[PDB]
Design a protein around this nucleic acid. Structure first.
Ligand SMILES: [Mn+2]
Ligand SMILES: [Mn+2]
Ligand SMILES: [Mn+2]
Ligand SMILES: [Mn+2]
Ligand SMILES: [Mn+2]
Lengths: 154, 153
DNA sequence: TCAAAACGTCGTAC
DNA sequence: TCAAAACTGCGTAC
DNA sequence: GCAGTTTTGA
DNA sequence: GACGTTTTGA
Protein backbone atom coordinates (compact mmCIF):
# COMPACT_ATOMS: atom_id res chain seq x y z
CA UNK A 1 0.00 0.00 0.00
CA UNK A 2 0.97 3.69 -0.49
CA UNK A 3 3.42 4.65 2.25
CA UNK A 4 3.39 8.38 3.08
CA UNK A 5 6.44 10.31 4.26
CA UNK A 6 6.70 11.08 8.01
CA UNK A 7 7.36 14.81 7.63
CA UNK A 8 4.19 15.06 5.50
CA UNK A 9 2.12 13.19 8.04
CA UNK A 10 3.36 15.37 10.89
CA UNK A 11 2.35 18.59 9.19
CA UNK A 12 -0.85 17.06 7.95
CA UNK A 13 -1.80 15.69 11.36
CA UNK A 14 -1.55 19.17 12.80
CA UNK A 15 -3.67 20.69 10.09
CA UNK A 16 -6.42 18.05 10.41
CA UNK A 17 -6.56 18.66 14.19
CA UNK A 18 -7.11 22.27 13.22
CA UNK A 19 -9.47 22.26 10.25
CA UNK A 20 -10.05 18.61 9.44
CA UNK A 21 -13.00 16.47 10.34
CA UNK A 22 -13.39 12.76 10.87
CA UNK A 23 -16.98 11.77 10.53
CA UNK A 24 -19.09 8.68 11.09
CA UNK A 25 -22.72 8.60 10.06
CA UNK A 26 -25.79 6.38 10.26
CA UNK A 27 -27.74 7.49 7.22
CA UNK A 28 -31.38 6.43 7.02
CA UNK A 29 -31.68 4.82 3.61
CA UNK A 30 -34.47 2.44 2.63
CA UNK A 31 -32.32 0.81 -0.07
CA UNK A 32 -30.15 -0.79 2.66
CA UNK A 33 -30.40 -4.11 4.54
CA UNK A 34 -30.86 -2.59 8.00
CA UNK A 35 -32.52 0.48 6.47
CA UNK A 36 -29.38 2.51 7.23
CA UNK A 37 -25.99 3.21 5.65
CA UNK A 38 -22.74 3.36 7.58
CA UNK A 39 -20.80 6.31 6.15
CA UNK A 40 -17.21 7.29 6.94
CA UNK A 41 -15.78 10.62 5.75
CA UNK A 42 -12.37 12.22 6.14
CA UNK A 43 -12.58 15.92 5.42
CA UNK A 44 -10.36 18.99 5.21
CA UNK A 45 -12.21 22.30 4.84
CA UNK A 46 -10.66 25.52 3.56
CA UNK A 47 -11.76 28.83 2.04
CA UNK A 48 -11.95 28.35 -1.77
CA UNK A 49 -9.60 31.30 -2.25
CA UNK A 50 -6.95 28.86 -0.88
CA UNK A 51 -8.24 25.94 -2.96
CA UNK A 52 -4.69 25.08 -4.11
CA UNK A 53 -3.90 23.61 -0.72
CA UNK A 54 -6.75 21.13 -0.90
CA UNK A 55 -5.91 20.32 -4.51
CA UNK A 56 -2.31 19.56 -3.52
CA UNK A 57 -3.59 17.11 -0.89
CA UNK A 58 -5.23 15.19 -3.68
CA UNK A 59 -1.83 14.99 -5.35
CA UNK A 60 0.06 13.96 -2.20
CA UNK A 61 -2.44 11.63 -0.53
CA UNK A 62 -2.89 10.25 -4.04
CA UNK A 63 -6.59 9.63 -3.69
CA UNK A 64 -9.68 11.68 -2.80
CA UNK A 65 -11.18 14.74 -4.39
CA UNK A 66 -11.98 18.37 -3.84
CA UNK A 67 -15.48 19.81 -3.91
CA UNK A 68 -16.06 23.55 -4.13
CA UNK A 69 -19.19 24.68 -2.27
CA UNK A 70 -19.38 28.43 -2.81
CA UNK A 71 -16.85 30.25 -0.64
CA UNK A 72 -15.47 27.11 0.97
CA UNK A 73 -13.91 23.95 -0.42
CA UNK A 74 -13.45 20.46 0.97
CA UNK A 75 -11.06 17.66 0.30
CA UNK A 76 -13.08 14.46 0.61
CA UNK A 77 -11.86 10.93 1.29
CA UNK A 78 -14.72 8.40 1.41
CA UNK A 79 -13.49 5.24 -0.36
CA UNK A 80 -13.35 2.88 2.57
CA UNK A 81 -10.08 1.11 1.87
CA UNK A 82 -7.78 3.98 0.90
CA UNK A 83 -9.31 5.64 3.97
CA UNK A 84 -8.06 2.73 6.01
CA UNK A 85 -4.52 3.01 4.60
CA UNK A 86 -4.30 6.78 5.13
CA UNK A 87 -5.84 6.99 8.61
CA UNK A 88 -3.61 4.11 9.65
CA UNK A 89 -0.46 6.11 8.91
CA UNK A 90 -1.84 9.41 10.22
CA UNK A 91 -3.37 8.24 13.52
CA UNK A 92 -0.08 8.12 15.41
CA UNK A 93 0.50 11.85 14.96
CA UNK A 94 -2.96 13.15 15.79
CA UNK A 95 -3.50 14.76 19.19
CA UNK A 96 -7.00 16.19 19.13
CA UNK A 97 -8.60 13.69 16.72
CA UNK A 98 -6.77 10.44 17.43
CA UNK A 99 -9.62 8.65 19.16
CA UNK A 100 -12.01 9.37 16.25
CA UNK A 101 -9.42 8.14 13.81
CA UNK A 102 -8.94 4.86 15.67
CA UNK A 103 -12.65 4.19 15.89
CA UNK A 104 -13.15 4.83 12.17
CA UNK A 105 -10.38 2.32 11.57
CA UNK A 106 -12.15 -0.15 13.89
CA UNK A 107 -15.53 0.28 12.17
CA UNK A 108 -13.92 -0.40 8.80
CA UNK A 109 -12.56 -3.77 9.87
CA UNK A 110 -15.81 -4.81 11.52
CA UNK A 111 -17.95 -3.83 8.53
CA UNK A 112 -18.19 -6.97 6.43
CA UNK A 113 -19.26 -8.71 9.65
CA UNK A 114 -21.64 -5.84 10.41
CA UNK A 115 -23.87 -7.02 7.59
CA UNK A 116 -24.38 -10.49 9.07
CA UNK A 117 -26.25 -9.66 12.26
CA UNK A 118 -28.56 -6.92 13.55
CA UNK A 119 -26.87 -7.46 16.93
CA UNK A 120 -23.46 -6.85 15.38
CA UNK A 121 -24.77 -4.03 13.21
CA UNK A 122 -26.08 -2.36 16.33
CA UNK A 123 -22.72 -2.74 18.08
CA UNK A 124 -20.97 -0.89 15.30
CA UNK A 125 -23.62 1.81 15.36
CA UNK A 126 -22.56 2.28 18.99
CA UNK A 127 -19.04 3.11 17.89
CA UNK A 128 -20.35 5.88 15.63
CA UNK A 129 -21.99 7.42 18.71
CA UNK A 130 -18.61 7.56 20.34
CA UNK A 131 -17.06 9.31 17.35
CA UNK A 132 -19.79 11.95 17.37
CA UNK A 133 -19.40 12.40 21.11
CA UNK A 134 -15.68 13.12 20.66
CA UNK A 135 -16.48 15.64 17.92
CA UNK A 136 -17.94 19.12 18.44
CA UNK A 137 -21.30 17.63 17.49
CA UNK A 138 -24.28 19.94 17.34
CA UNK A 139 -26.88 18.76 14.79
CA UNK A 140 -26.76 14.95 14.89
CA UNK A 141 -30.07 13.12 14.42
CA UNK A 142 -29.67 9.39 13.78
CA UNK A 143 -28.22 7.74 16.88
CA UNK A 144 -27.75 4.00 17.32
CA UNK A 145 -30.81 3.94 19.56
CA UNK A 146 -32.68 5.26 16.50
CA UNK A 147 -31.53 2.24 14.57
CA UNK A 148 -32.50 0.20 17.62
CA UNK A 149 -36.04 1.54 17.33
CA UNK A 150 -36.74 0.46 13.77
CA UNK A 151 -34.86 -2.81 14.13
CA UNK A 152 -37.48 -3.73 16.71
CA UNK A 153 -40.33 -2.61 14.43
CA UNK A 154 -39.08 -5.36 12.06
CA UNK B 1 17.31 30.92 23.11
CA UNK B 2 15.75 27.46 22.81
CA UNK B 3 16.07 24.92 20.01
CA UNK B 4 12.72 23.25 19.43
CA UNK B 5 12.29 19.64 18.31
CA UNK B 6 11.77 19.33 14.55
CA UNK B 7 8.98 16.82 14.86
CA UNK B 8 7.28 19.31 17.08
CA UNK B 9 7.71 22.24 14.75
CA UNK B 10 6.34 20.24 11.81
CA UNK B 11 3.11 19.38 13.63
CA UNK B 12 2.67 22.80 15.19
CA UNK B 13 3.13 24.38 11.77
CA UNK B 14 0.16 22.40 10.52
CA UNK B 15 -2.03 23.27 13.46
CA UNK B 16 -1.06 26.94 13.08
CA UNK B 17 -1.90 26.98 9.35
CA UNK B 18 -5.22 25.68 10.63
CA UNK B 19 -6.27 27.62 13.74
CA UNK B 20 -3.33 29.95 14.30
CA UNK B 21 -3.01 33.64 13.77
CA UNK B 22 0.03 35.76 13.07
CA UNK B 23 -1.17 39.29 13.77
CA UNK B 24 0.51 42.65 13.13
CA UNK B 25 -1.31 45.77 14.30
CA UNK B 26 -0.73 49.52 14.48
CA UNK B 27 -2.29 50.80 17.68
CA UNK B 28 -3.29 54.45 18.14
CA UNK B 29 -1.68 55.22 21.52
CA UNK B 30 -0.62 58.79 22.43
CA UNK B 31 2.00 57.54 24.89
CA UNK B 32 4.24 56.50 21.90
CA UNK B 33 6.65 58.48 19.64
CA UNK B 34 4.50 58.65 16.56
CA UNK B 35 1.28 58.15 18.51
CA UNK B 36 1.17 54.50 17.40
CA UNK B 37 2.37 51.18 18.82
CA UNK B 38 3.49 48.48 16.41
CA UNK B 39 2.24 45.25 17.96
CA UNK B 40 3.08 41.68 17.05
CA UNK B 41 1.03 38.70 18.23
CA UNK B 42 1.32 34.97 17.67
CA UNK B 43 -1.82 33.17 18.72
CA UNK B 44 -3.48 29.81 18.63
CA UNK B 45 -7.20 29.70 19.41
CA UNK B 46 -9.14 26.79 20.85
CA UNK B 47 -12.45 26.06 22.52
CA UNK B 48 -11.73 26.15 26.26
CA UNK B 49 -12.73 22.54 26.74
CA UNK B 50 -9.46 21.78 24.94
CA UNK B 51 -7.43 24.24 27.03
CA UNK B 52 -5.08 21.43 27.98
CA UNK B 53 -3.87 21.41 24.37
CA UNK B 54 -2.92 25.10 24.71
CA UNK B 55 -1.34 24.36 28.12
CA UNK B 56 1.02 21.86 26.56
CA UNK B 57 2.04 24.52 24.03
CA UNK B 58 3.15 26.91 26.75
CA UNK B 59 5.13 24.06 28.33
CA UNK B 60 6.88 23.16 25.07
CA UNK B 61 7.51 26.61 23.69
CA UNK B 62 8.57 27.55 27.20
CA UNK B 63 7.36 31.10 26.77
CA UNK B 64 3.92 32.69 26.22
CA UNK B 65 0.67 32.25 28.16
CA UNK B 66 -2.99 31.19 28.02
CA UNK B 67 -5.96 33.57 28.15
CA UNK B 68 -9.60 32.65 28.64
CA UNK B 69 -12.57 34.53 27.18
CA UNK B 70 -15.76 32.70 28.04
CA UNK B 71 -16.03 29.69 25.77
CA UNK B 72 -12.75 30.28 23.93
CA UNK B 73 -9.12 30.17 25.10
CA UNK B 74 -5.91 31.44 23.51
CA UNK B 75 -2.23 30.72 23.47
CA UNK B 76 -0.53 34.05 23.10
CA UNK B 77 3.08 34.99 22.39
CA UNK B 78 3.94 38.67 22.17
CA UNK B 79 7.36 39.28 23.68
CA UNK B 80 9.42 40.49 20.74
CA UNK B 81 12.60 38.53 21.54
CA UNK B 82 11.24 34.95 21.85
CA UNK B 83 8.74 35.67 19.10
CA UNK B 84 11.69 36.17 16.75
CA UNK B 85 13.44 33.00 17.92
CA UNK B 86 10.26 30.89 17.66
CA UNK B 87 8.98 32.20 14.31
CA UNK B 88 12.44 31.76 12.75
CA UNK B 89 12.35 28.07 13.62
CA UNK B 90 8.67 27.57 12.78
CA UNK B 91 8.73 29.58 9.53
CA UNK B 92 10.24 26.99 7.19
CA UNK B 93 7.40 24.51 7.80
CA UNK B 94 4.47 26.89 7.31
CA UNK B 95 2.47 26.63 4.10
CA UNK B 96 -0.42 29.04 4.53
CA UNK B 97 1.13 31.62 6.86
CA UNK B 98 4.79 31.45 5.88
CA UNK B 99 4.63 34.85 4.24
CA UNK B 100 3.14 36.43 7.36
CA UNK B 101 5.72 34.62 9.47
CA UNK B 102 8.57 36.23 7.54
CA UNK B 103 7.14 39.76 7.31
CA UNK B 104 6.86 39.69 11.12
CA UNK B 105 10.37 38.32 11.34
CA UNK B 106 11.66 41.27 9.41
CA UNK B 107 9.49 43.93 11.12
CA UNK B 108 11.23 42.82 14.32
CA UNK B 109 14.77 43.20 13.00
CA UNK B 110 13.85 46.74 11.95
CA UNK B 111 12.10 47.73 15.18
CA UNK B 112 14.92 49.67 16.89
CA UNK B 113 15.72 51.26 13.54
CA UNK B 114 12.12 52.38 13.07
CA UNK B 115 12.22 54.41 16.27
CA UNK B 116 14.37 56.89 14.28
CA UNK B 117 12.51 58.70 11.48
CA UNK B 118 8.93 59.27 10.37
CA UNK B 119 9.89 58.00 6.91
CA UNK B 120 11.20 54.72 8.24
CA UNK B 121 8.53 53.80 10.79
CA UNK B 122 5.73 54.11 8.23
CA UNK B 123 7.66 51.98 5.76
CA UNK B 124 7.51 49.31 8.43
CA UNK B 125 3.81 50.18 8.69
CA UNK B 126 3.32 49.11 5.08
CA UNK B 127 4.94 45.79 5.93
CA UNK B 128 2.14 45.53 8.50
CA UNK B 129 -0.26 46.38 5.67
CA UNK B 130 0.92 43.37 3.75
CA UNK B 131 0.41 41.05 6.71
CA UNK B 132 -3.26 41.95 7.08
CA UNK B 133 -3.47 41.54 3.31
CA UNK B 134 -2.44 37.89 3.52
CA UNK B 135 -4.69 37.31 6.53
CA UNK B 136 -8.45 36.83 6.41
CA UNK B 137 -8.81 40.45 7.56
CA UNK B 138 -12.38 41.73 8.06
CA UNK B 139 -12.49 44.50 10.71
CA UNK B 140 -9.24 46.39 10.30
CA UNK B 141 -9.16 50.19 10.90
CA UNK B 142 -5.75 51.68 11.53
CA UNK B 143 -3.84 51.05 8.30
CA UNK B 144 -0.46 52.51 7.44
CA UNK B 145 -1.97 55.52 5.76
CA UNK B 146 -3.90 56.70 8.82
CA UNK B 147 -0.38 56.74 10.21
CA UNK B 148 1.22 59.55 8.34
CA UNK B 149 -2.24 60.98 7.96
CA UNK B 150 -1.55 61.75 11.58
CA UNK B 151 2.11 62.53 10.83
CA UNK B 152 0.46 65.21 8.64
CA UNK B 153 0.49 67.49 11.72
C1' DT C 1 7.97 56.19 26.90
C1' DC C 2 7.75 51.72 26.00
C1' DA C 3 7.24 46.54 26.10
C1' DA C 4 3.82 44.03 27.20
C1' DA C 5 -0.63 42.78 29.09
C1' DA C 6 -5.56 43.08 29.59
C1' DC C 7 -10.23 43.29 27.86
C1' DG C 8 -13.89 43.62 23.88
C1' DT C 9 -15.82 43.23 19.03
C1' DC C 10 -17.09 41.10 15.08
C1' DG C 11 -17.69 38.04 10.91
C1' DT C 12 -16.82 34.33 9.17
C1' DA C 13 -14.21 29.88 7.79
C1' DC C 14 -14.86 26.29 9.15
C1' DT D 1 -27.96 -3.65 -2.35
C1' DC D 2 -24.18 -1.41 -2.03
C1' DA D 3 -19.99 1.74 -2.24
C1' DA D 4 -19.62 6.06 -3.23
C1' DA D 5 -21.06 10.51 -4.63
C1' DA D 6 -23.82 14.80 -4.47
C1' DC D 7 -25.97 18.42 -2.25
C1' DT D 8 -28.03 21.21 1.74
C1' DG D 9 -28.45 23.10 6.72
C1' DC D 10 -26.43 25.08 10.53
C1' DG D 11 -24.08 26.82 14.71
C1' DT D 12 -20.05 27.82 16.21
C1' DA D 13 -14.82 27.72 17.07
C1' DC D 14 -12.32 30.20 15.64
C1' DG E 1 -16.56 21.60 11.27
C1' DC E 2 -20.21 18.26 11.53
C1' DA E 3 -23.61 16.82 10.31
C1' DG E 4 -28.23 15.96 7.30
C1' DT E 5 -30.87 14.26 2.91
C1' DT E 6 -30.58 12.49 -1.52
C1' DT E 7 -28.87 10.44 -5.67
C1' DT E 8 -25.76 7.48 -8.69
C1' DG E 9 -24.92 3.18 -11.16
C1' DA E 10 -24.15 -1.13 -11.49
C1' DG F 1 -9.36 34.04 13.49
C1' DA F 2 -8.26 38.88 13.13
C1' DC F 3 -8.66 42.55 14.76
C1' DG F 4 -9.77 47.18 18.23
C1' DT F 5 -9.41 49.65 22.67
C1' DT F 6 -7.22 50.27 26.81
C1' DT F 7 -4.20 49.77 30.72
C1' DT F 8 0.11 48.21 33.30
C1' DG F 9 4.48 49.47 35.46
C1' DA F 10 8.88 51.12 35.51
MN1 LIG G 1 -10.09 23.69 14.93
MN1 LIG H 1 -18.38 16.89 22.06
MN1 LIG I 1 -8.30 27.53 9.29
MN1 LIG J 1 -10.43 26.37 12.20
MN1 LIG K 1 -7.56 38.52 2.21
Amino acid sequence: NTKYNKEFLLYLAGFVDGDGSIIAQIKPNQSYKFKHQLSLTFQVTQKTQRRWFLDKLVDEIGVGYVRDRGSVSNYILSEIKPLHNFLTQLQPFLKLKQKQANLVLKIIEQLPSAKESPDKFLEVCTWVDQIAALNDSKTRKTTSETVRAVLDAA
